[PDB]
Structures are given as C-alpha cells and as structure tokens.
Paper text:
In 2021, we reported the development of insulin icodec, a basal insulin analogue with a long half-life that would allow once-weekly dosing (A14E B16H B25H B29Nε-C20 diacid-LγGlu–2xAdo desB30 human insulin). Insulin icodec is a once-weekly insulin analogue that has a long half-life of approximately 7 days, making it suitable for once weekly dosing. Upon slow and continuous dissociation from this albumin-bound depot, insulin icodec activates the insulin receptor and elicits its biological function.
Next, we determined insulin icodec’s crystal structure to find out if the stabilising effects of insulin icodec substitutions have a structural explanation. Importantly, side chains for the mutated amino acid residues in positions A14, B16 and B25 occupy roughly the same space as the corresponding side chains in human insulin. Lys B29 is pointing into the solvent, and the fatty acid attached to it is disordered and not visible in the electron density, as has been observed previously. Structurally, icodec molecule 3 differs from the human insulin structure in the conformation of both termini of the B-chain. The C-terminus of the B-chain deviates from the dimer-forming β-sheet conformation from residue B25H onwards. The observed conformational differences between molecule 3 and molecules 1 and 2 are a result of the trimeric arrangement in the crystal. When looking at the 3D structure around the disulphide bonds, the A20-B19 environment is affected by the substitutions in the icodec molecule. The side chain of Arg B22 is located directly above the A20-B19 disulphide bond and alteration of its conformation and dynamics will change the solvent accessibility of this disulphide bond.
Author numbering:
A (entry chain B), B (entry chain D): 1 to 29
C (entry chain F): 2 to 28
D (entry chain E): 2 to 21
E (entry chain A), F (entry chain C): 1 to 21
The structure:
Amino acid sequence: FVNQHLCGSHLVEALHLVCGERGFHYTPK
Amino acid sequence: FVNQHLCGSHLVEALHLVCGERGFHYTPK
Amino acid sequence: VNQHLCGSHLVEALHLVCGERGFHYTP
Amino acid sequence: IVEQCCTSICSLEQLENYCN
Amino acid sequence: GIVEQCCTSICSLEQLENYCN
Amino acid sequence: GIVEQCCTSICSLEQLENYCN
C-alpha cells in the first residue's frame, strides 16, 4: 500500500506521476 | 482574461481547479 | 506581471499557502 | 478558483480555504 | 472512486494505475 | 491536445473546460 492518504492535489499529482505518458482521469468521488 | 501558458503540474492542477466536481482527463499531448 | 502566467502563479501560490497539506478545488 | 483570482487579486485568507 | 480509495482510505500503487488512461 | 493548446500555445478557460469530464 502507499504510505499515506492522498487527497486533492496530492492525489492528482500521484496519478500524474504514476500514469506518465498514458495520462489519467480524475473524478473526485 | 488573456489566454494562459500552463505546463506540467501547473496545467494538471489548473484542470483540477477549473473542472471541480466534474473531474477531468489529462493526456500529455 | 505577465498576465499569461496568472493560472500558473495561482497554482504556485496555493502550493506555498497550503504547503504540505495540499489543496482542493472548493473552499 | 482560477476564475476569481485571475479576474481579481486573491488574499492569503481566501487561498487558505482551499487547503486540505 | 479514487478519492474514496486513496483519500478516505489508504490505497495501493495498483489502484492508482487503474485510473491511468 | 491540452498540452499543445496550453503549453506550446496559450489557451483559454473554455479550452481547459473542454477536458472536464
């Protein structure tokens, strides 16, 4: 598991990093 | 306002903040 | 300043205001 | 909100309300 | 969704990857 | 896509809103 909760910009930027060139989709639910 | 220059995380976070509850989809292209 | 960088500057400001808490879209 | 702070100047107190 | 998984709860790298395009 | 529109060129709010879900 990841080490911490990821909320808001922290979660958006985690997805941004992890998904890289594939890109991602974010729905705040 | 005038058109904006947005790259990298600034662009991703702009989309986060603009789209709000709708969420967004991001592909770096 | 460069009005084309307002959004960019806003995101930078939120980063420094909220520091390590992170931020979200609603107040 | 990008609309408000780029159609005006936003204070510190207003930015803090967006923090997690 | 990903907020419930990763913000309310604690998630995994695999769960984050499920939201890559 | 949005990078070409907002990083290579400069883009409007309406163009960002096109990438909302």
